[PDB]
Amino acid sequence: ITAYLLKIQRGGFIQPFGSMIAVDEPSFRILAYSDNARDMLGIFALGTDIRTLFTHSSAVLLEKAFSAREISLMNPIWIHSRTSGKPFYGILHRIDVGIVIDLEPARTALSIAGAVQSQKLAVRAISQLQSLPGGDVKLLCDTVVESVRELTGYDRVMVYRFHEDEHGEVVAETKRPDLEPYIGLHYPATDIPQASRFLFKQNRVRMIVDCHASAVRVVQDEALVQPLCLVGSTLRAPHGCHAQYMANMGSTASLVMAVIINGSMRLWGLVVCHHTSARCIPFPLRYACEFLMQAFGLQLNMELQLAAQSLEKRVLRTQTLLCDMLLRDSPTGIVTQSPSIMDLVKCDGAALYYQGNYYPLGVTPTEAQIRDIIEWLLAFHRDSTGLSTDSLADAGYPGAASLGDAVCGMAVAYITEKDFLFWFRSHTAKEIKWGGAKHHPEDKDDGQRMHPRSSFKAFLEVVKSRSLPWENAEMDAIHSLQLILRDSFKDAEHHH
Ligand SMILES: *[C@H](C)[C@H]1/C(=C/c2[nH]c(/C=C3N=C(/C=C4\NC(=O)C(CC)=C4C)C(C)=C\3CCC(=O)O)c(CCC(=O)O)c2C)NC(=O)[C@@H]1C
């Protein structure tokens, strides 16, 4: 199917800082515990009810978790072990077979006084985030990392945006000062498999408290169909590849949280936190930050919204311009009079060739150069109503590709077989700091690949003759001008 996907879904292992016990909902008898249960809760049982193991108060709270409308709301429930007195945050969620109970020990009265302190810091931070004049995504991510770091204490926190490749880039970071900085570093789209990404869409915050710690096995009675869904569990164990990936990166413990937007929801980026030591932050702080991530996502959705607004606003003006040019008398006026085809679309140059004569503007090829590009175009591309590329080299055109570092991106529109419209752009500098590896599109997640990369040193890639890419908006502008000009030239043809 999809690589890794339920090797993680029903992994059958959890982390060492608490333990997960799944239970039938009307039996209240255990379908599954973990072999670290009976000691750290303070002792054992199997196929047993759970109200047995601590205060009848705690049973009041769990039965009232079970008949809640909306299980999700009562978390974090709080329990106290009869055999020990030990306090644990209980965190529940309903799955197929039943309900899952994650139990995280609380810290050792003295630090709940600071736990609430950082929860009020969390509201203050969400309101600070909403009190922000839009139109500045850099400022957004900066304030997000600063307040997540001051909330959680992690040594490194950053925002990691996904590119259309689903390869990612550290786009803002604040760190303990001694650590090497990962700002600017792009990483390969395969470091996070599409399985793990689409799975972040449902579960939105993951902590791992120590990678060098030995995971604990599940107990499942053998009657049950298979290892159950452990996606929802706070203390899920991590896949081995990502564990050694951490170890190699120098990140002992990490907190990493989705950043989501809703059109049917997609994953914009992550917020990722690194501790060089082991860190376990209590579930309240986790929940609060998840709200802060929600606010992140929504102020981003506002930035997107106004992107789209202003885009359609400039679409409107290129249509004022389309009319304006339908009014010029002769094709040459496309280039002749005030608003020319070099203003249709962001250009370095542009040109029209119509009937054996050359009408160019901006940075352009020669007459001989142009006719060679057209000889190539018709020789190979006779079936596509034009084309667009950001490197005539990479495209496959030999010749002026060599003779052009001032002309490297090209878009062209077939009017008829005889004559064409052209827009050109020069090379312009992209340097990319790759963090150990370049992203290879042809690579895609391999399920039984068991080992990760070894290094992460920066290295400059330099793309050496690329134009900025033609976006669909500029392509739409061109294509529609193409259509109206075919219409118009045969209107004139048949009038005369
Ligand atoms: C194994 C051969 C391949 C592999 C698998 C893999 N990766 C993940 C999950 C994550 N990978 C990252 C990557 C990063 N963490 C960082 O700090 C950075 C740089 C800023 C990167 C690029 C992340 C964030 C995750 C999410 C996991 C988490 O919650 O922290 C998984 C899923 C892990 C799981 O058990 O759920 C897997 C299977 N990664 C590789 O590199 C190999 C190609």
**CATH H level, superfamily name of the domain at 5-10 and 108-305:** GAF domain
Figure out the total of helices: 12
CATH topology of the domain at 5-10 and 108-305: the name is: Beta-Lactamase
* Count of strand segments: 20
Identify the overall geometry: elongated
Tell me roughly what share of residues is in helical segments: 25-40%
Structural class based on helices, strands and sheet pairing: alpha+beta
PDB class: plant protein
Keywords: phytochrome, plant protein
Assembly: monomeric
Entry title: Photosensory module (PAS-GAF-PHY) of Glycine max phyB
Features:
plant protein; monomer; Phytochrome B-2; 8-stranded mixed sheet; 7-stranded antiparallel sheet; binds phycocyanobilin; 496 residues; Beta-Lactamase; alpha+beta; 33% helix; elongated
Give a structural overview:
The structure is a monomer. Helices cover 33% and strands 24% of the residues. Among the domains are: 204 residues, 2-Layer Sandwich (Beta-Lactamase), CATH 3.30.450; 131 residues, PHY domain (Beta-Lactamase, 2-Layer Sandwich), CATH 3.30.450.270. The longest helix has 44 residues. It is an alpha+beta fold and 496 residues long. It is elongated, with a radius of gyration of 30 Å. The site of phycocyanobilin (CYC) has 26 residues, from strand 8, helix 7, strand 12 and strand 13. This is Phytochrome B-2.
